[PDB]
Design an enzyme around this catalytic site. Structure first.
Site, short mmCIF file in Angstrom:
data_model
loop_
_atom_site.label_atom_id
_atom_site.label_comp_id
_atom_site.label_asym_id
_atom_site.label_seq_id
_atom_site.Cartn_x
_atom_site.Cartn_y
_atom_site.Cartn_z
N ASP A 121 0.92 -1.23 -0.07
CA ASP A 121 -0.02 -0.23 -0.04
C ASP A 121 0.86 1.28 -0.03
O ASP A 121 1.77 1.38 0.82
CB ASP A 121 -0.83 -0.15 1.23
N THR A 159 -6.86 3.46 -2.40
CA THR A 159 -6.86 2.13 -1.93
C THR A 159 -7.66 0.95 -2.44
O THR A 159 -7.18 0.18 -3.45
CB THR A 159 -6.73 1.96 -0.44
N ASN A 685 -23.67 8.68 -23.96
CA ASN A 685 -23.95 8.06 -22.54
C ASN A 685 -22.69 7.97 -21.82
O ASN A 685 -22.56 7.18 -20.87
CB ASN A 685 -24.65 6.93 -22.80
O1 LIG Z 1 -7.07 0.91 6.53
C1 LIG Z 1 -7.51 0.98 5.63
C2 LIG Z 1 -6.68 2.29 4.62
C3 LIG Z 1 -5.86 2.20 4.31
C4 LIG Z 1 -4.95 3.05 3.47
C5 LIG Z 1 -5.62 4.27 3.17
N1 LIG Z 1 -5.34 5.34 2.56
N2 LIG Z 1 -6.60 6.21 2.54
N3 LIG Z 1 -7.80 5.67 3.28
C6 LIG Z 1 -6.97 4.35 3.76
C7 LIG Z 1 -7.80 3.25 4.36
N4 LIG Z 1 -7.92 -0.08 4.81
C8 LIG Z 1 -8.28 0.07 3.31
C9 LIG Z 1 -8.30 -1.59 3.22
C10 LIG Z 1 -8.18 -2.42 4.55
C11 LIG Z 1 -8.64 -1.33 5.43
C12 LIG Z 1 -6.49 -2.79 4.28
C13 LIG Z 1 -6.43 -4.41 3.98
N5 LIG Z 1 -6.70 -4.18 2.48
C14 LIG Z 1 -7.15 -5.64 2.00
O2 LIG Z 1 -7.34 -6.65 2.65
C15 LIG Z 1 -7.60 -5.96 0.54
C16 LIG Z 1 -8.78 -4.93 0.15
C17 LIG Z 1 -9.35 -5.24 -1.09
C18 LIG Z 1 -8.65 -5.99 -2.01
C19 LIG Z 1 -9.06 -6.12 -3.47
C20 LIG Z 1 -10.05 -5.15 -3.40
C21 LIG Z 1 -10.40 -6.85 -3.45
C22 LIG Z 1 -7.39 -6.57 -1.45
O3 LIG Z 1 -6.82 -7.43 -2.75
C23 LIG Z 1 -5.42 -7.52 -2.66
C24 LIG Z 1 -5.09 -8.24 -4.06
C25 LIG Z 1 -5.47 -7.69 -5.28
C26 LIG Z 1 -3.98 -7.74 -4.75
N6 LIG Z 1 -6.77 -6.48 -0.38
C27 LIG Z 1 -6.40 -3.18 1.72
C28 LIG Z 1 -6.70 -2.07 2.84
CA LIG Z 2 -21.24 5.65 -25.78
ZN LIG Z 3 -3.56 5.66 1.93
#
Ligand SMILES: O=C(c1ccc2[nH]nnc2c1)N1C[C@@H]2[C@H](C1)[C@H]1CN(C(=O)c3ccc(C4CC4)c(OCC4CC4)n3)C[C@@H]21
Ligand SMILES: [Ca+2]
Ligand SMILES: [Zn+2]
Ligand SMILES: *[C@@H]1O[C@H](CO)[C@@H](O[C@@H]2O[C@H](CO)[C@@H](O[C@@H]3O[C@H](CO[C@H]4O[C@H](CO)[C@@H](O)[C@H](O[C@H]5O[C@H](CO)[C@@H](O)[C@H](O)[C@@H]5O[C@H]5O[C@H](CO)[C@@H](O)[C@H](O)[C@@H]5O)[C@@H]4O)[C@@H](O)[C@H](O[C@H]4O[C@H](CO)[C@@H](O)[C@H](O)[C@@H]4O[C@H]4O[C@H](CO)[C@@H](O)[C@H](O)[C@@H]4O)[C@@H]3O)[C@H](O)[C@H]2NC(C)=O)[C@H](O)[C@H]1NC(C)=O
Ligand SMILES: [Cl-]
Ligand SMILES: [K+]
Ligand code: NA
Length: 806
Positions: A121, A159, A685
């Site tokens: 991230d 994210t 559209n």
């Molecule tokens: O605290 C936060 C957060 C972090 C940074 C920020 N900046 N600004 N605001 C923010 C809020 N968050 C967002 C989500 C969750 C809680 C964390 C764990 N996660 C997954 O577990 C995941 C979530 C979704 C997906 C994908 C969307 C399904 C995924 O996939 C990883 C594989 C594709 C490589 N992993 C991604 C982060």
């Molecule tokens: Ca169109």
């Molecule tokens: Zn962030």
């Protein structure tokens, strides 16, 4: 309700999800408050830490330990990752020379090289260079495998939209996760970061890699990790899964790091506090690669190291307040921060007006740090419109700024010094890509590419057929040693007509006049040659575009340009011409200012007419091949044919005239000639896709002449600029744009000035891929070159961004 009275005994990090009310033991149970009572005790052991020490070697197995240094640990799958280093005299993976992995070297029973997705991230692209001293594991993956200088995220550079784009190959408008925060008016439901609605399946469209894999009989590790599960335990779990028996072992795995985003928000992208989170990620990478090496998997597994977005310097004192612009500030709901989305606070309010909100936000302060758009007017390269969850009103915020509703929102909601979410062409938002393994290339740098392309490649890595997505399958073949997907050109659906002279001047009643009645087989045989295509190899360098839908159109040849003329839309679909470095710009002679000429190849009934333009008080006209670039006075007459004319607002004619009169020649001069393909786009559209005739919302008044929403150009030359555009032996170079066809220039705050102060900046903002134009037109370009098709697909996905060196 979960009756959490069962046990995780033997079930730790189980791969099938048990249904309520039986208690869960999977890597996500914490996040659902649904783990069995003994989950922590059994499944989250921490005793003795994560590393073997000399004294633990050959120890007697104590099942209470977080990991093991006993003799039986390799076969049980649960040694500390440094076990063989400390106890068996082995080297760390990072200390070994890299050696090419020519073929997968896997243990018996592996049917295919596993894929591990290591996602980070907020990992900004320049960390690879700027942090290289403190990341030796990551630097080894990068220099030994395949890497890009950077990878482009999707907009918004948040994210969830980006992680889900990685998983699906889709634009957020199509997968539905259009920000970190959303309102769906149909569900009447809100998606938030904290909370439970975000777990409901209805938000998540398309088909993520884990589901693609599962439907095609390839088993997946569960991709998501509860935040409190520490990185060391995540790694140990993946490694344990990799020791499962053949029938039970997943083939694809994901690891996720909250760092460096977490610290970057607190300290800014390059805060001194950022060195440590970079060390710590590297250490996790080292742990994984050591663990793979122990399992004899370090020359078997493909590893992708990939970020979701970068991180910019952003502070509380750089916030713009909508209360400084709007009187009615409490009648709106704003989704705030690094982008803005505005809707009405209440649907029961009919005094709500989007046009007055936009006017109140347009060019109001000299240094204003955001720009309002109706979503359909956003740059087409953002693909951010075709979803009910994206508010009609949008604010593109300048890099380094926030927008908020009122100052109270900022002090009763400075803390943060970093943020992300800005325009996806911004350098600070770019992120990383490294591929390492048998299926990737050895020590290879590839050009920057977009994260939407990765899903296809991940499918290829696992032998899966990708679900329909926004990648261009084959455009990343050059990343791979093998497993390439061999794409073919789509078949032309409509073949053109080649009309000859079929009509007399007097059959036309178009209200057009031209002062062209001034009169030799020397020059008359010659012009007949031109009209039958004698110069077509000069102006059509890559073959004619193919029309990929059913329609009726004519190829028209001219000395200086060739066109594909649509009898349905009454104007060209495309106009192709080449301008050499030595070409000369001339003016429109005085006598020919208002000249429009009937085309004797095309029936009156399939022509535009000048009367409609006269009567339509809003709409004027322009030409696709510019009169200014005529090769001679006699050739100039061709540029005034009614079949080269297209409808243009006077406001837009300022932009178009400057591009044709000034910028084409400048590009030809700088690039050693250019080939130009220009044409209209209709996307009423706003779905990124060519409109059918029954979708057109506007016509030139009193006629069937449809009004384009956009005008595109594709400008191609030789990558080796020592060769002229028309004699290029090798790879090509392209830049393209899709200009919105708007009745005003409100978008450009400096538009009262000379076009040389504002037009190029507008065009840059609306830079596009050839592929974006392909979707908007149902055309397919570059059908006849000397280049391989995969290389052409890469060229079609290229975006010229105008940012400086990363
Ligand atoms: O605290 C936060 C957060 C972090 C940074 C920020 N900046 N600004 N605001 C923010 C809020 N968050 C967002 C989500 C969750 C809680 C964390 C764990 N996660 C997954 O577990 C995941 C979530 C979704 C997906 C994908 C969307 C399904 C995924 O996939 C990883 C594989 C594709 C490589 N992993 C991604 C982060
Ligand atoms: Ca169109
Ligand atoms: Zn962030
Ligand atoms: C990027 O890649 C993607 C994926 O390839 C491209 O998107 C595809 O484009 C297709 C054309 O627009 C579209 O095809 C339509 O599908 C309709 C059935 O849709 C459902 O099933 C699919 C397949 O499993 C599913 O994926 C869909 O999921 C969408 O909707 C759900 C919930 O609503 C979301 O969870 C999900 O995120 C996704 O949302 C996105 O797409 C929809 C459009 O489907 C948007 O509205 C959203 O905003 C969002 O962006 C669906 O669950 C099918 O019914 C359509 O058929 C109509 O038109 C054809 C013409 O061929 C005609 O034969 C039929 O009669 C029918 O017309 C009838 O319905 C009309 C409208 O209601 C009505 O006017 C008529 O009078 C008729 O009654 C059509 O085939 C395909 O679904 C999407 N796929 C995805 C994943 O989005 C995208 O175009 C690419 N982008 C670019 C720039 O290239
Ligand atoms: Cl958001
Ligand atoms: K007019
Ligand atoms: Na303006």
């Amino acid at each position: 309700w979960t009756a959490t009275s069962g046990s995780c005994k033997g079930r730790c990090f189980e791969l099938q999800e048990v249904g309520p009310p039986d208690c869960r033991c999977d890597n996500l149970c914490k996040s659902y408050s649904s783990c069995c009572h003994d989950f922590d005790e059994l499944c989250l052991k921490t005793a003795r830490g994560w590393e073997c020490t000399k004294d633990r070697c050959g120890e007697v197995r104590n099942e209470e330990n977080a990991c093991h240094c006993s003799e039986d640990c390799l076969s049980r799958g649960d040694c500390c990752t440094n076990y063989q280093v400390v106890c068996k005299g082995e080297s760390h993976w990072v200390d070994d020379d890299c050696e090419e992995i020519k073929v997968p070297e896997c243990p018996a029973g592996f049917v295919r090289p596993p894929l591990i997705i290591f996602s980070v991230d907020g990992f900004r692209a320049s960390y690879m260079k700027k942090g290289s001293k403190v990341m030796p594991n990551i630097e080894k993956l990068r220099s030994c495998g395949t890497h890009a200088p950077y990878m482009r995220p999707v907009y918004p550079t948040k994210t969830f939209p980006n992680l889900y784009t990685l998983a699906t190959g889709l634009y957020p408008e199509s997968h539905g996760i259009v920000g970190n925060s959303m309102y769906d008016p149909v569900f009447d439901a809100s998606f938030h970061l904290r909370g439970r609605e975000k777990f409901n399946h209805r938000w998540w469209g398309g088909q993520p890699l884990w589901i693609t894999a599962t439907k095609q009989g390839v088993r997946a590790g569960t991709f998501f990790w509860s935040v409190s599960i520490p990185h060391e335990r995540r790694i140990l779990t993946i490694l344990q899964w990799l020791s499962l028996p053949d029938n039970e072992r997943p083939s694809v795995y994901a690891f996720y790091s909250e760092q460096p985003d977490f610290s970057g928000h607190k300290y800014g992208p390059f805060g001194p506090e950022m060195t440590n989170p970079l060390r710590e990620i590297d250490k996790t990478v080292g742990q994984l690669m050591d663990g793979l090496k122990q399992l004899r998997l370090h020359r078997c597994v493909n590893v992708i190291f990939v970020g979701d977005h970068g991180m910019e310097d952003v502070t509380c004192d750089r916030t713009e307040f909508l209360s400084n612009y709007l009187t009615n500030v409490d009648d709106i709901t704003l989704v705030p921060g690094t982008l803005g989305r505005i809707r009405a606070k209440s649907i029961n309010n009919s005094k709500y007006d989007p046009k007055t909100i936009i006017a109140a936000l347009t060019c109001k302060k000299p240094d204003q740090h955001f720009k309002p758009y109706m979503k359909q007017h956003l740059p087409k390269r953002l693909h951010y419109a075709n979803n009910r969850r994206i508010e009609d009103i949008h604010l593109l915020v300048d890099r380094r700024w926030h927008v908020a509703r009122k100052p109270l929102d900022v002090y009763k909601k400075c803390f943060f010094q970093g943020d992300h979410g800005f325009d996806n062409k911004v350098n600070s938002m770019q992120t990383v890509f490294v591929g390492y393994g048998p299926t990737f290339k050895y020590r290879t740098k590839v050009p920057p590419f977009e994260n939407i392309e990765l899903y296809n490649v991940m499918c290829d890595l696992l032998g899966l057929k990708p679900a329909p997505n926004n990648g261009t399958h084959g455009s990343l073949n050059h990343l791979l040693r093998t497993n390439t997907f061999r794409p073919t050109m789509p078949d032309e659906v409509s073949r053109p007509n080649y009309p000859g002279i079929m009509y007399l001047q007097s059959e036309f009643d178009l209200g057009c006049t031209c002062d062209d009645k001034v009169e030799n087989k020397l020059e008359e045989l010659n012009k007949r040659l031109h009209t039958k295509g004698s110069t077509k190899e000069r102006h059509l360098l890559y073959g004619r575009p193919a029309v990929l839908y059913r329609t009726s159109y004519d190829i028209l040849y001219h000395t200086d340009f060739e066109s594909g003329y649509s009898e349905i839309f009454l104007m060209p679909l495309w106009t192709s011409y080449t301008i050499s470095k030595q070409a000369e710009v001339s003016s429109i002679p005085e006598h020919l200012t208002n000249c429009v000429r009937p085309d004797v190849r095309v029936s009156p009934g399939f022509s535009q007419n000048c009367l409609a333009y006269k009567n339509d008080k809003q709409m004027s006209y322009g030409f696709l091949f510019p009169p200014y670039l005529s090769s001679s006075p006699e050739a100039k007459y061709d540029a005034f044919l009614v079949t080269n004319m297209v409808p243009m607002y006077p406001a837009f004619k300022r932009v178009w005239a400057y591009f044709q009169r000034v910028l084409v020649k400048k590009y030809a001069s700088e690039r050693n000639g250019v080939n130009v393909i220009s044409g209209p786009i209709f996307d009423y559209n706003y779905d990124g896709l060519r409109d059918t005739e029954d979708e057109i919302k506007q016509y030139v008044e009193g006629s069937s002449i449809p009004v384009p929403t956009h005008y595109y150009s594709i400008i191609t030359s030789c990558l080796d600029f020592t060769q002229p555009a028309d004699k290029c032996d090798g790879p090509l170079s392209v830049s393209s744009f899709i200009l919105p066809h708007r009745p005003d220039n409100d978008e450009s705050c400096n538009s009262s000035e000379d076009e040389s102060k504002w037009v190029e900046e507008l065009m840059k903002m609306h830079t596009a891929r050839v592929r974006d134009i392909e979707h908007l037109t149902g055309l397919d370009f570059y059908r006849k070159t000397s280049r391989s098709y995969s290389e052409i697909l890469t060229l079609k996905t290229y975006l010229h961004t105008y940012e400086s060196e990363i």
